Design a binder for this molecule. Structure first.
Ligand SMILES: *O[C@H]1CCO[C@@H]1COP(=O)(O)OP(=O)(O)OC[C@H]1O[C@@H](n2cnc3c(N)ncnc32)[C@H](O)[C@@H]1O
Ligand code: NA
Ligand code: NA
Length: 326
DNA sequence: CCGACAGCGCATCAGC
DNA sequence: GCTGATGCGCC
């Protein structure tokens, strides 16, 4: 399917999703609307009625009702009303700033702070994350083409290896799945001297990337997880590159390949792989693969030395990251 | 009828 | 000072 099919419907549910998350603070309704929007997006027919829709998993009576009103009128009275509501539309908007969630956004709107402009002139009321969110607002909503992503990886792999050539680093996410575009860059990191039963391995890497001016800002940083901002170097006499979000995780060697598997995704793959792994009598999380004893008692973590090792535990042939779409 | 719906690292806040 | 809750972004 393409947008033309049911796009009007999926954008409707998407709008509703966002209002529930950001304004109503109903994360479960947010996820329900998204489930609905997603499954309709894959459905290869121009839907004709709510009842047709209701046959799909995740679409219930309420969405089938909404689809009917939209089909017959071309709009939803609720969305129309919401869209015109200064308070709600402003609360929703502010959440686009990284670090401003629905609670901060409601607080800001409670006190008259409604726009980026109001944020700009109210710097003191923003934490560190939010200020970086604000500063990079437009940059953070841009996608990252694969070629820039390839250039970003070049930099990360070169500099990590310079710090210690025994580091293992893997750019995961959709990029590793061969996506043509990316939302950010997620880098998983491990070192032989770091296992489950075992200095500042992560700080040393972050610092090197800051030394060559690849990492430009820090959103959060501890011993195992770094979240921040990076930027490719502008070619001599040429427009700067956008600033990009990058996350760096330090994982123990023995849970590294579980981490790669998990953070490569995508979600559908993990959910199905975990599902099938349950049928086959193991449990897989982000960190481990544990077998289930006769009743339901998960034993200790199994030895994993590669992504394939975990496939080779649950009788699956190693699927490539290219086809871990579902 | 009613609860699950993922849960974790980190920054910052509420409260002692 | 400290500890725990809360908010946030994230497959
Ligand atoms: O989220 C709903 C689905 C599961 O439980 C709730 C409530 O269901 P209902 O009591 O059957 O319906 P309702 O509370 O009226 O609808 C909830 C949302 O939809 C809007 N809405 C208000 N009134 C209606 C009616 N009569 N029909 C459809 N939708 C309606 C509300 O603004 C709510 O957000
Ligand atoms: Na359904
Ligand atoms: Na945000």
């Amino acid at each position: 399917p393409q947008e033309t099919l049911n796009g009007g419907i999926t954008d409707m549910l998407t709008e509703l999703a966002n209002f529930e998350k950001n304004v109503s603070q109903a994360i479960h309704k947010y996820n329900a609307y998204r489930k609905a929007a997603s499954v309709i997006a894959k459905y290869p027919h121009k839907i004709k009625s709510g009842a047709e829709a209701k046959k799909l998993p995740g679409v219930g009576t309420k969405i089938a009702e909404k689809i009917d009103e939209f089909l017959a009128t071309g709009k939803l009275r609720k969305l129309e009303k919401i869209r015109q509501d200064d308070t709600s539309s402003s609360i929703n908007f502010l959440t686009r700033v990284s670090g401003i969630g629905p609670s901060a956004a409601r607080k800001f709107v409670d006190e008259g702070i409604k726009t980026l402009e109001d944020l700009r002139k109210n710097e003191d009321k923003l934490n560190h994350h939010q200020r970086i969110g604000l500063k990079y607002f437009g940059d953070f909503e841009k996608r990252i083409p694969r070629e820039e992503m390839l250039q970003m990886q070049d930099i990360v792999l070169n500099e990590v290896k310079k710090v210690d050539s025994e580091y293992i680093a893997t750019v995961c996410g959709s990029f590793r799945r061969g996506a043509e575009s990316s939302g950010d860059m997620d880098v998983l990191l491990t070192h032989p001297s770091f296992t489950s039963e075992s200095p500042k391995l992560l700080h040393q890497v972050v610092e090197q990337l800051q030394k060559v001016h690849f990492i430009t800002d820090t959103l959060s940083k501890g011993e195992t997880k770094f979240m921040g901002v990076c930027q490719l170097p502008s070619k001599n006499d040429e427009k700067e590159y956008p600033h990009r979000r990058i996350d760096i995780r330090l994982i123990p060697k023995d849970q590294y390949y579980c981490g790669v598997l998990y953070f490569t995704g995508s979600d559908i793959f993990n959910k199905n792989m975990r599902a099938h792994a349950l049928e086959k009598g193991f449990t897989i999380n982000e960190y481990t693969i544990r077998p289930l004893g006769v009743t339901g008692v998960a034993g200790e973590p199994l030895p994993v030395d590669s992504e394939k090792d975990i496939f080779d535990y649950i009788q699956w042939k190693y699927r490539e990251p290219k086809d871990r779409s579902e």
